[PDB]
Amino acid sequence: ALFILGVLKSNAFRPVKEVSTDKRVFSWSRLLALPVDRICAYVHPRMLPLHNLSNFGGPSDRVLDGQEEVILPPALRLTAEEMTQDGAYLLENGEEMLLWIGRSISPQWLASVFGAHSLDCVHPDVAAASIGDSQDPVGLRVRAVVQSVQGEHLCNAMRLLVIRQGDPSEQKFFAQLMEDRVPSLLLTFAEFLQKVDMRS
């Protein structure tokens, strides 16, 4: 019921006024020929926190190489109440990555990742390539997370569109929050179980 509710909110079955025609064509062509691990990634995006990367680490800080796996423990739930304004959050849905950054993100974290002094010093276009460029250990670990989810799938081609809180491109992130309520379906997972239990 979680994954079915995922494809209702996805681009495959959204109402017409919010997804164009040829976007739905490519979503249907993907879903008819993708493997099961990429279809469930499309209907259930995986969310990771990036602002507390120093917290989720051992006392040895086991060197980040891929020889041993780049450590990615926490898979966050897909609802807005665990979102925190001082946080960065990476979401992948098998097609694109969206890196939501809050307004109250730490400037020390921003200078480590993108080398920017402020959130206004970041635009969605170039900051995908700016990750890990400043060579600070915090931002290099962010690039470790981005490349790990990139190579975990079959193909290493999956664009990264960084989103600040307050830009017009924020709605593509918040629509992928499947447990939330989006402009397509105004139902959470709690209400959707209730609707399919009285119908059953």
């Binding site: 807005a80 109440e81 979102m83 304004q85």
Partner: peptide
């Protein structure tokens, strides 16, 4: 029951 302020979004 479920009130106005109590069922907004925290974000």
């Amino acid at each position: 029951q479920e009130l106005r302020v109590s069922r907004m979004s925290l974000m």
